[PDB]
């Protein structure tokens, strides 16, 4: 095997990367990497475009709840489960979507915008932090509130060095689990607070969502590490090329003469001395003595293959980040239907995975945290004859699924024909087909049974879905 | 035969590779090869893209259980087998998919995330290790927990040399079988523990999944050995080319004169001395004496054939890794439907093989480990009059199949038409067609029989699948 | 005839190859050729791709048994043959597909994985060896075990010279048949054992599978001898071209002056002395005295015709190995449907031949070895009133056919239409149509007759295959 060897001619003799865990590689330069990722996101067109694509495709314009408790395990009954789910869904829908935005302490974000911010933070910071608090002064129906904590705030107190149990502001028990986090207080023009992960009663107090790569990993790594250097180098190349083009296009001509500069421009260029401005009106034919000369400068091609090199670098960056090349670069060159569909599918697989993990876990944990007080305050009533209480089986009572914006297809008619053909056979159900369009099938049925009554009352022809 | 000969003109005279086992080639430089593969994965856009493609296509966004015990062998009866399968599937679904993430000791990953991490570890490290433990302090329903052990941790104690029976921290019996493993403890700012492969009762304590190449192979080899050198050399070429382009684009022009440098720029470039900055506003025509000169530099083509060489190297890398060229390089050049379908099939065969072996074996062993407690703690009851106990035939009781995300078609209508035509004939069943879409046909049937009742109750037109 | 003559102008005067058997050409340099093939497989991207294609297409993701005993010969009856086949197939499932992997001594591979490893070994080593042993300490139902022996281990004892009867560790009787083998024991940081080919009772103890080319051939030859030299030379050319491109791209410019190097770089390049680093920010216009000079280097085309030469060499290599050019090189250039189908058929013929011979013979012999104990231990009962007992006609009792993964075609709809039309006419049966899809028609019928009952019980519309 030449992987561990010296190389072809010994070229890989100096390539001896150390063997170390993910923590040993990531933690020493965590803050610098995060700052560089933030710099790239704020001040580069492509990084901001990638973040916007992540936000728009992973979550969308809405994030909707679907409460499906496991009634078999609980032994309560299907109808009671349906009634409980309807009540819980109504309560959650009013709680999250108030215009006062009292879901968060800062009163600036709704639930959907909070999910989008969490996804964005997971993108260029590798993780997201959420804290759940209670305000006693509040007289509203619910006291639960959520605060989005930036990863920069969590760090070791007093800027102390890492230990075996405490790393990067995270306290670790004997196992890999985390017991608590140290959150700093930021003064824009310091102190640290201990926040336990979970309350003694089992409620989740502070939320941390990230995907671990190796066995022992305390905090996550942003996606920009793969292509961080190339983005900066490409920005430098773009600025240099633009400045060079401006400079080369500036010098249009050159005057050579042995006379005074005022005299030379007077006799050759045509300026009026009554250095010296020249009027652009008209065409001029100067007369030159033997010593005089007039040279019109020629410049190189403004874009001499910079476009193709930029194309290659943008393909590399899009491969590193995960978004499609066309989406990142806005190129959308000529291509057949099959190629566009294949690229869309390749991007959609990654987007679906990100939605399934990050946003779904965050929303599920927030929903469980809210549901615990909702049940405690008797806003909703648990079904009777339950095998287990809410505390004993939290996941069983609070099992849920989340629906986001569906993919907008290149051909609208083909997808509709496919859906109709699937519905005609037994391969698919109404729920799955409506969920692909970002709709709830029960709401569609209610709207249809309302519309048929409205049509009948007005005297119009009954709709297709109506039963004779 | 010229294979063992000197060559055409004697060119292969120095090519005399040693004849040795896979262990003799792999073990001496195991750690350096693993470290180089990790370096490529962390810091190259293409390697990270390949790992992400592996994770997404091999597993997907979900990994689902299908329990099919062999009822004929055990002599229990079909209906008891179906009831047992329903119970164990429900228990597994609740156990793996809790939001508390209590399946693993570190409480960071769900079952699907652990499967994806195992696939990733198999990709760039050549193997995956899983440890199953019990916590007695836990008061939950199940005490089983799983921990993913990095391959770096398994090594010979005290960094001692390999022996005949103990190689790379694995103790080997007279045959090729492994009896136990030595796992180190990592301190981020050492000691070794003996972990037997199997408990005395026959339970699996330590899990090791990899594909052997030759007869005697203690540990597996990463996939990057084939293309390790080329990726590093291509990265060096890319960085060098980018720096060279930036350098050549930087120098726009050149001034030649015998005067002072400030005066030369004042009279020619146009800088103001009130070295010296020059304003970009306007167009200028300087006046030059005989000794003076102005030269506008021209540069070579920025991308002069680098794209084609990069294409060739990327095809080589994609051949080595196994992913498609379009997926790896994000190129997706103009191509017909047939070529895209052929490349997709060529990649899908490899992905299906990897899913059938690695993830399936890992998930099956974890499921058996959980099922042993589940049966022991009497959460589920074995059918009566069974020929053999659970211990005597573990595979018969725990026979199962796993379903992941299905391939996304380039043309949605064509696959639906194909599935419908197959269903109409006897060549296919409902289960196989639903499995290709990542769905369970029994859940679809339950949803349909619920939806028909819902439509009937609300007064809507009965669905197609309903029976008159 | 000029084939044996001097040539056109005497150019073939030195071309006088010796006339010798295959053994005389192969045996003297067997080990060096095998080592070179192993080196190419481990360390070249294309060779690994070819081996992976062999494994994926010849075997696939599964290998399945179809027991077809010849009842007419033995005069037992069709129904008894069916019952015996069902029992044997069930028993072979459990032995081969246990998760404990107790089929092999090393407990690392399942039956399909051992078949794939055998195919791979036949690919780059020219043959495969399998050993069947018994473990008395085992308390399981079956004591049969299989060990894949690397071809390197079999060699002459004490590294002695070959004889008339003993060549390369294989003892040959008066005829060409082999009586036994000498297998060495490998110590990774020596002794030889005599293993007879067959037990005295007729059972197969040692398995050797290879295709003979000529009359007397003791051991087989790998496929790589045809194209090993070209692969090594192409790898050298690729590495040299990459290094040359990096070297030529590295030198961006050149400074010529009579001053000191520090002064020259300060005045021309723009470095700061407060050798000398230069910041890349901005565009610069240096001033040069008559002695000074600035030159921007221009390099040759990075990929100047290397791609087409690589294409030709890859076509030659793919022709030598037997795989299609597109599969080997991942090129998949623009091409019509007919050309793609023709290339796919050309490759599929070779893959079907390899599957029919190598894997089928290996699996059949292993199945016979297992079936002998299975019958002896009375796990399965032979039908009564049989003409010849198991010993008299092993092949008649153990006649079987093996099924692998079916070909993935470019157009899914066309293949389904073709299969439906063939089924409608009398040209084809259900078994052949289901076999091309890698399915067992009896299993499909059982699944259909279950699904129709499941649909009827739930109240859904009866399936198409149901009989009124």
From Swiss-Prot, chains A, B, C:
Major site of localization recorded for this protein = virion
GO MF: DNA binding; structural molecule activity
Q: How is it modified after translation?
A: Proteolytically cleaved by the viral protease during capsid maturation.
A Gene Ontology cellular component where this protein is annotated is: viral portal complex
Localization in the cell: Virion
The record ties this protein, via Pfam families, to: Phage_portal_2 (PF05136)
Keyword check for Cell inner membrane, yes or no: no
For this protein, the record's InterPro entries field holds: Phage_lambda_portal
GO term, biological process aspect, one: virion assembly
Give the UniProt keywords, A-Z: Capsid protein, DNA-binding, Viral capsid assembly, Viral genome ejection through host cell envelope, Viral genome packaging, Viral long flexible tail ejection system, Viral penetration into host cytoplasm, Viral release from host cell, Virion, Virus entry into host cell
The family line of this record is: Belongs to the siphoviridae portal protein family.
Q: Which HAMAP family match?
A: PORTAL_LAMBDA
**General function of this protein:** Forms the portal vertex of the capsid. This portal plays critical roles in head assembly, genome packaging, neck/tail attachment, and genome ejection. The portal protein multimerizes as a single ring-shaped homododecamer arranged around a central channel. Binds to the terminase subunits to form the packaging machine.
Q: What do we know about how this protein assembles, alone or with others? A: Homododecamer. Interacts with the terminase complex composed of two small and one large terminase subunits.
Q: What is this protein called?
A: Portal protein B
User: Species name for this entry?
Assistant: Escherichia phage lambda (Bacteriophage lambda)
From the UniProt record, report the name of the gene that encodes this protein. B
